[PDB]
Amino acid sequence: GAMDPNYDKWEMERTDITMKHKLGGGQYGEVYEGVWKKYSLTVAVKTLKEDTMEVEEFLKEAAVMKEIKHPNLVQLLGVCTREPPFYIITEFMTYGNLLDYLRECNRQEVNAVVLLYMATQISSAMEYLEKKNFIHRDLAARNCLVGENHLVKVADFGLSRLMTGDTYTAHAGAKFPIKWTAPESLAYNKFSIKSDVWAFGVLLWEIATYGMSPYPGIDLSQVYELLEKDYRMERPEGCPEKVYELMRACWQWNPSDRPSFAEIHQAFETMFQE
Numbered sequence: 001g002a003m004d005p006n007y008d009k010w011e012m013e014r015t016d017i018t019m020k021h022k023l024g025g026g027q028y029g030e031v032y033e034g035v036w037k038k039y040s041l042t043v044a045v046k047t048l049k050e051d052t053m054e055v056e057e058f059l060k061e062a063a064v065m066k067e068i069k070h071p072n073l074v075q076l077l078g079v080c081t082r083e084p085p086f087y088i089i090t091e092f093m094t095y096g097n098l099l100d101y102l103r104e105c106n107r108q109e110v111n112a113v114v115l116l117y118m119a120t121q122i123s124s125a126m127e128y129l130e131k132k133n134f135i136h137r138d139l140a141a142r143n144c145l146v147g148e149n150h151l152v153k154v155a156d157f158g159l160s161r162l163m164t165g166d167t168y169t170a171h172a173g174a175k176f177p178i179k180w181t182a183p184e185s186l187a188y189n190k191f192s193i194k195s196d197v198w199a200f201g202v203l204l205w206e207i208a209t210y211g212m213s214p215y216p217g218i219d220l221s222q223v224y225e226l227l228e229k230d231y232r233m234e235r236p237e238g239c240p241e242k243v244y245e246l247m248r249a250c251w252q253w254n255p256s257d258r259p260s261f262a263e264i265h266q267a268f269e270t271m272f273q274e
């Protein structure tokens with residue numbers, strides 16, 4: 001509605017999108033595969049009709065997505081927050097989440113140099129968020145998406161609500177991904193760009209291991225104590241020593257010592273010969 005107070009270019013007609021069925025990928029809740037009829041365009045449509053403490057948090061999500069734009073950040077297309085069944089319309093990434101992809105991929109195709117390119121793309125998205133003073137809070141393979149040509153977008157699916165298993169452990173109603181969470185976020189509940197950097201190093205290990213769970217075989221209860229004793233994950237099989245040295249950088253105990261995504265990104269840019 002144009003000539004009306006509080007205009008919004010992101011507001012679209014719910015009528016313009018057909019909803020197929022829920023996106024399968026371990027179910028993201030009320031998130032459907034859609035088609036924007038006019039444009040013959042497949043989209044992802046996050047809805048809401050089961051939560052109601054969410055409603056207000058559903059619209060904070062929408063607002064946040066309006067303020068961010070990067071080629072490696074999942075792209076908002078439109079919202080429907082005018083009438084009851086609210087939509088958040090996003091581009092559709094052909095190959096679902098980055099965790100399953102790495103786990104199910106052909107490794108001849110997703111060869112050494114693809115894995116690095118996927119990593120360079122994420123650091124790019126995060127250098128952007130960093131530039132923007134945006135704290136992501138849940139950087140993990142499960143929150144990334146894979147398009148055509150090994151294209152990786154960083155996203156956020158609200159998975160501490162979805163969780164069925166041992167990835168998000170209960171922590172005062174707040175659910176935490178312990179094995180991705182930095183020590184300061186664990187002990188003192190302080191999140192910042194530098195706590196995203198720590199998560200990044202874990203995600204880099206997820207990528208190099210083709211989607212293996214962090215700290216294999218060790219239980220959650222003893223993760224922090226180990227880190228306190230300066231125990232980090234060891235170099236994955238086949239991983240460059242310069243990629244690993246960067247992992248260890250992100251995993252520095254002191255947050256002020258961890259690289260910026262600026263300097264992580266340039267490291268990937270520099271490394272990008274061959």
Ligand SMILES: Cc1ccc(NC(=O)c2cccc(C(F)(F)F)c2)cc1-n1cc2cnc(N)nc2[n+](C)c1=O
Nearest residue numbers: 028031044045046073088090091092093096154155156
């Ligand atoms: C439908 C939807 C609506 C909103 C969002 N929002 C985010 O991913 C997001 C929310 C807040 C912040 C961020 C960011 F900081 F990481 F950019 C990202 C994602 C989606 N979304 C998108 C998908 C696109 N492609 C595919 N294959 N799956 C998708 N899923 C499961 C989604 O939830």
